[PDB]
Symmetry: C2
Subunit: 563 residues, 2 copies
Amino acid sequence: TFRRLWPTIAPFKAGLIVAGVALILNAASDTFMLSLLKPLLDDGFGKTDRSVLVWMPLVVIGLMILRGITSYVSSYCISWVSGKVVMTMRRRLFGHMMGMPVSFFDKQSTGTLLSRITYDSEQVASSSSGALITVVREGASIIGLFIMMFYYSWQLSIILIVLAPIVSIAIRVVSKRFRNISKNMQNTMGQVTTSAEQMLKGHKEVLIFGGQEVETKRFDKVSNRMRLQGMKMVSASSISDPIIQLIASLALAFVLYAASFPSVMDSLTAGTITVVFSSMIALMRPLKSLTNVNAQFQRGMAACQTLFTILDSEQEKDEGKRVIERATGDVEFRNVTFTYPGRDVPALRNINLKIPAGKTVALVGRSGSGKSTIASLITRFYDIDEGEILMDGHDLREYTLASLRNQVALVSQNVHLFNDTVANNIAYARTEQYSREQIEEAARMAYAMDFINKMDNGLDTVIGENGVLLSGGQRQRIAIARALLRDSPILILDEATSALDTESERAIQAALDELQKNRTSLVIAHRLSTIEKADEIVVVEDGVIVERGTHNDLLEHRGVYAQ
Amino acid sequence: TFRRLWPTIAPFKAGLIVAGVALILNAASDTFMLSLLKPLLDDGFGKTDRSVLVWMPLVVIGLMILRGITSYVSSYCISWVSGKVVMTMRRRLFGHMMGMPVSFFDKQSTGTLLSRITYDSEQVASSSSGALITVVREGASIIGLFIMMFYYSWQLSIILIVLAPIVSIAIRVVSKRFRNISKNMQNTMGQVTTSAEQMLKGHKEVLIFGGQEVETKRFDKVSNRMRLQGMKMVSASSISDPIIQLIASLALAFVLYAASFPSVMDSLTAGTITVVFSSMIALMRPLKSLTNVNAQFQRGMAACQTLFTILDSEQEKDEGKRVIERATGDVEFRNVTFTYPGRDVPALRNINLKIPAGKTVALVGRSGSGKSTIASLITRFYDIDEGEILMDGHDLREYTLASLRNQVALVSQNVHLFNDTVANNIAYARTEQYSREQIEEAARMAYAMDFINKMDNGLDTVIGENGVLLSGGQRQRIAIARALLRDSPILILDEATSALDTESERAIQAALDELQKNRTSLVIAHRLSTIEKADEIVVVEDGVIVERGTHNDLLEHRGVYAQ
């Protein structure tokens, strides 16, 4: 997976290499601080000299200011590659998510989409850089310390080379056994954890049936099991490191025994042995991290693989041919066979529904099925499987999706509002073309200045981020204002307000009449007024046309005509 | 953090003190493993040849065995206190959670409650213990190291004890600047984070207007502002440790310059200076983790304040005094007024309603305004604001709440079955009273035994999560079985299910007719069959009884009676 991530990080190598050289110097400023111990004792408290000891406090600041300056440079210029290999791939994920079919947001992935761009994005540069802060730094501390051992005491360095790899495999095997036991139990605590959710959801039945005592008893039992596995998990966790320390001490003791087993040893000065022993203690942490540097790296790269799954999914079907400036004619349906993806029940049978030019087709307000779904096919939110839809007396498959949707203009109370200025919001992707000269008149005839004027900055104000939070009816009104860039052939109004707010419902009715003077329409009709104002109501229910005819026919065949 | 939580720890202190003595010994096995340097460098490689050095390996395993065993005992017997102050906390929370009214479950908490029962109670004894390991182990390592310095070098130990408070306050102020800078802009990170979320949620209206290009353009700059603030976060985070190391090196250099003078020279051997240099390095970690004690112990108990608020909330109004054995008498609603909690709109104004003895009253959900709310007052899910419900000629406020819920028995499609045996499930809190002789016969004439026989074990099988997974109608039939054994003198049914499943509707209707044989049964009638079989219909919407009389009077005043 790192193979595929490499092109994404490749142009941002300049920060990486500076991180890969400012960390080696961070490994050669911890193995060179220790070397000064040999001058400090052999030449400072052995051969008694002040000249050899007065520059020591100087060089134990220069090395440490180097440690600080290289640590900052590493943590920054590796944060810079962890700011241009997480930001660029965030931008790629967002640019691909916007194009992906809306069916994906229909419970293929519904709430994790933030975590799939924020946290799961961060764990490709907060725990893959942690495998290049450690492979280089702690993997160079080992090399530096071994170079020190060779330069000072080959006699004990050979012994370390014999032993330390054995300590490493010991560390790995005990860590692996602990990890197996830990992740074996993780499913167990998850299973006993969801049990409490199962009780908490049914607070209702728990209250109604005779008592909670039988429920409290079971909760007590599962809590006791929770604890008696949690303590076992901790015992497995906190015993791994003591055994590691003990086996590492076996090396520290075997070297000390080998420091006197022959007469060849014990000829080493105090400085050399103090340096050697200090180095052995400073070899523990890098050995432990170099073995652990396959956990972090593979965690990060598996999370990146899952991000790649999100990124690699099929784009929206972009095979349309004809660019429509205006579908001057009318929309027609023809034998459309559509099913909700992920389901088996067909959503719509063969439909041949005629919507005429310059008029409106209403729909049965409460069909119970296939009411809002039929509005989907004009906007190609979910593409049709078989059967065609005739834009302007021309098939929809022939039309580019952007071109298709430029024509359509949806309105509903559930309309999600953009968050830039009102001037941009009304003319989103059209601000340079449709200037405020149009937007002033649009807000005039929108009947929405009761909140745009009252906002006191309505001509230019941020409309989202919950900045103003116009109510849902006002969202419908400003949706009409959005459509008041006009020339939109199809006008889908969900009309699901169910609330005749004072003059606002009459306002949207008047604006609908204005948008019906020149443009077509296709409305879901719950309100009786629109049903009367409808021109040809092709009522459809249960995936099949049940009745066709204008208001007089619907009065003749009431069906569900009420109130 | 003011005189808090102690009695939940107090009986479980015998495991605590073993953690407070197995950690001091863990402080006295890191400050005593270092002291052995002086024998090694004076009596070992220094003056004396051998025969004392040969003991040093044997005591760098014994001290290390004591290090490992102490660590294991501390990490186990401190988790045992984290397994009798977590388990006790969870049990206290849960036991105070189902007696604590349903009104809390009306989205005062949606799904954070699992946080407050699992994670927010793990993080009381996972970061108060984590701030008691450090304030004892690394609060005794300082004492051990200072004892070592005093015993081995009186001269420069005074210098160190002068600098240490200076290093400590330096650490405190740099950490405070880091805290104030990092957490100042974390809310800015939240702001830029939600900016992607809002525009992702509205996948619609980004694609209908062809605003994908402007969308990516407006996302790119917020991603850039994400990166350019994350860089400042990580630079402020990783600049603290270098400055800390540099100021601590200022100490390591000042002491070394002090070591140069003749006054302290020739009183410190090679071993003495090495041990007081190794100890100086081993004081860095304890000193810098001790100042973070209040950065965990108040990152901790502050979180426990949420649990204490949950546990301090008001209990359910169990002020009833009259215990009811059988409630065969009819029920009265007497000028009852009620509001759904947190809402100014009256959910139910004055109502005077009759539930006759051995008879049924049906409700039709036309407006969907209080159809289900009126059911709740019968079980007193939400208490009555004013007015009375004379149940069997006596008010609910007199009736003890447990008995009150015993008399009633809700049965709706939204019945949350609970994981248990099917027999115990059928006799929830009554498995001792109702034996299998009752269960099998009730299930037989509950018309559910076909489903019980369909899965594996039947009369003793499990009804657990993701197990048998009875359908909606099936679990409704389980609920009628429950009421059948309990013989609930009051019965409530919602019938929110719309589709009448084969081999279920006739069984449901026969069971219902059994349930009005000698029992009162209020019903919410969505089925026309139940409407026609209803005995005394009173139709209630908009908080008051809008229509009266049986289906003949409902034919006189049709409304939606035709449908």
